[PDB]
């Protein structure tokens, strides 16, 4: 199985056979496959290399934008860089340094609390870096943030879904802006607004278009409710979801097969009135058939994680305060990566 | 936990 | 009801609507609203109750990736000048690996 895939990769991009020994397939995702390979350096020792084979249905501008994120933003501040890139026709392979890393699920229950602090700090370093360039990653989640516990090394990876802010410094992301473009009624309004009613007027309206590339369980509420003007705040929400998994011991934390089920789960954690209030500020009316109160984050996480030893026995208030700011339902007030690095949770750190 | 099938452009 | 398209949503539900009223609302109806399950063992979600795609080059849906990639339309795009934007970025990277000559069979 893996053997035929490797043989086919050498056939697809023949230059690889003169440079790399492809040893194994380490990743299989929606838009790429990633292989472990060994190469010799002209001036250094042998190196392990991650070869990312982009799906050949990818548009060339999308391929180039991913590469440009890696070359311009990557290579420092815990953002993966690129060593080289090989192309034959529609087959593009990005060669990156291989970072040996933990499985998030495997280490979730053995991380010390101090290691959770260090992990979050270094995630925010990476997000501060990409957000400075106006990159909205859109798919912040543990499999896109590689962590080597022993070496204390971190790498944000995978710019295959990224979009640009209006401000972006990644030239090619001006061709993939996060601001949606809408498609192409006898009565504009109807009496169903903010009620449980439906009628022929509202049901027959066109559909709103908004970006939503990403992964189920990590999308911010403004994504789930089809806000056409999304910002780097969606990445900070996703970082909040990672933190919520770390503090609760539960991963994946949310488990939903569609956007409004994900929203219903968020309302069950953060409260329905709180979610409704925030959504009004970005132009969305949410109605739920039952009101549910916000959960206290400390009680929730500690009850789901169970008895704490060592650092886990006395998690500081600052941790749940930072979590509350990351999971801010209002994307305008949600904490930024730059601000998060200044939060008291990170007292006495680098 | 893979990405959804669709993305922009 | 369904014939007149007018009525009320069966509960429980979530309904979302853009406040401009320009767009169709979207709805969620499920049998059970989410329940936080603290009994299920970690690391499980407290909400746990348990080759098709689109070619961006051809602007076409496909049901089998490998089949689409072999189609004549996709091959023509793959072999075109549309990747100059990629090659322009590559030409600024520095190649620092050892490159071997091809091995030719002997005798
Ligand atoms: N530079 C790298 N070093 C080590 N492992 C990597 C690297 N890049 C990717 N991976 C592995 O490959 C997986 C897939 O990488 P990613 O860029 O997310 O592609 P995909 O979109 O297919 O998931 C990652 O979760 C990680 O396990
Ligand atoms: Zn990824
Ligand atoms: Zn109506
Ligand atoms: Zn609800
Ligand atoms: Zn195609």
Residue numbers in the entry:
A (entry chain A): 39 to 222, 346 to 471, 534 to 573
B (entry chain C): 38 to 46
C (entry chain B): 207 to 256, 292 to 348
How does the study describe this entry?
CDC7 possesses the canonical bilobal kinase fold, which is interrupted by unique kinase inserts (KIs). The structures reveal a zinc-finger domain at the end of the kinase insert 2 that pins the CDC7 activation loop to motif M of DBF4 and the C lobe of CDC7. We conclude that CDC7 activity is controlled by DBF4 at two levels: (1) via ordering of the activation loop dependent on the ZF domain-DBF4 motif M interactions; and (2) via the control of αC insertion through by DBF4 motif C (Hughes et al., 2012).
Co-crystallization was only successful using the bisubstrate approach with MCM2(33–47) peptide covalently conjugated to ATPγS via bromoacetyl-aminoalanine in place of Ser40 and pre-phosphorylated on Ser41. X-ray diffraction data were collected to 1.7-Å resolution, and the structure was solved by molecular replacement. The nucleotide bound in the active site and nine residues of the substrate peptide, spanning MCM2 residues 38–46, were built in the resulting electron density map. No density could be attributed to the γ-phosphate moiety, presumably due to hydrolysis of the bisubstrate ligand during crystallization. In the crystal structure, the phosphate group on Ser41 of the target peptide, mimicking priming by CDK2, forms well-defined interactions with side chains of Arg373 and Arg380, invariant residues from the CDC7 activation loop and the C lobe, respectively. In addition to the interactions involving MCM2 phospho-Ser41, the side chain of Arg44, located in P+4 substrate position, is buried in a pocket lined by CDC7 and DBF4 residues. Concordantly, substitutions of Arg44 in the context of the substrate peptide resulted in relatively minor defects of the in vitro kinase activity, in sharp contrast to the near complete loss of phosphorylation upon removal of the priming phosphate on Ser41. The ordering of the activation loop allowed co-crystallization of the kinase in complex with a target peptide.
